[PDB]
Symmetry: C2
Subunit: 148 residues, 2 copies
């Protein structure tokens, strides 16, 4: 399959860039991974604009998973389950959406096939990216039946 | 005043290390924190073996927060709160516990004064360390009203 992560803002701190580099390399063995890093920025007109800027990158064929706190908190086994089930049917494209400070436009949310929540806590989106990649790498390991 | 982090596994990845150092640095300004790493291997006897290891580093008069997937999930607000409300319970020594890949022994859990959860999904311990430290900073930052 081929995974796409559409995020907001460019990674600043090097330790995160390196960490993501690593997992991306690892996940690369199980499927294709591409991280679309697009530029950022009462005032929801910016949220909405960013919302169309994201949709511009989303494939009509991709099963979209937007990261949001009002989302379903799946287990690692459940995220793995979801991906396996998508492979079972023709769903070879999976795209994850990580909003920015502002958040995600109602339009992006409407397009999303599902909302996933990683925690009740707040994490900087730079870090959320690193967690997300690792987690997807973990989902595939689970699915390939590897102990990890 | 004093926050300890007792974890299983000597962290190598200087990317994580870089991140942890960087965050643990801003923290020493509100309280100094020390991370205790224990050597790890790579059935169950090994997990318990790691339990006493963890316990021999935990003062009996310390408030122990065990990070368990099954633990209670707080928001950065509920975490900032429980950290401040400890200073008043006559608990100046607080220790966070992050188990190895196997998990936390039975003795560690029962020694735990509270069980904290960061998500329903599993994170690698090495990565959980950077997340715990980042969250603690956020808590302090939140506690002093200072915006983060």
């Amino acid at each position: 399959m081929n995974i796409n992560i559409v995020t907001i803002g460019k990674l600043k701190e090097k330790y995160l860039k390196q960490g993501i580099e690593e997992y991306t390399k690892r996940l690369s063995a199980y499927a294709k991974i591409d991280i679309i890093e697009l530029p950022d920025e009462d005032m929801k007109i910016i949220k909405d604009k960013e919302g169309d800027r994201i949709l511009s990158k989303i494939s009509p064929d991709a099963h979209v998973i937007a990261l949001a706190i009002e989302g379903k908190m799946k287990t690692s086994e459940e995220l793995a389950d979801t991906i396996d089930k998508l492979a079972t049917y023709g769903k070879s494209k999976v795209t994850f959406v990580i909003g920015g400070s502002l958040g995600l436009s109602d339009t992006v949310m409407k397009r999303a096939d599902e909302k996933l929540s990683f925690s009740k806590m707040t994490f900087p989106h730079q870090l959320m990216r690193l967690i997300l990649v690792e987690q997807i790498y973990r989902a595939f390991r689970i699915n390939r039946g590897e102990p990890y």
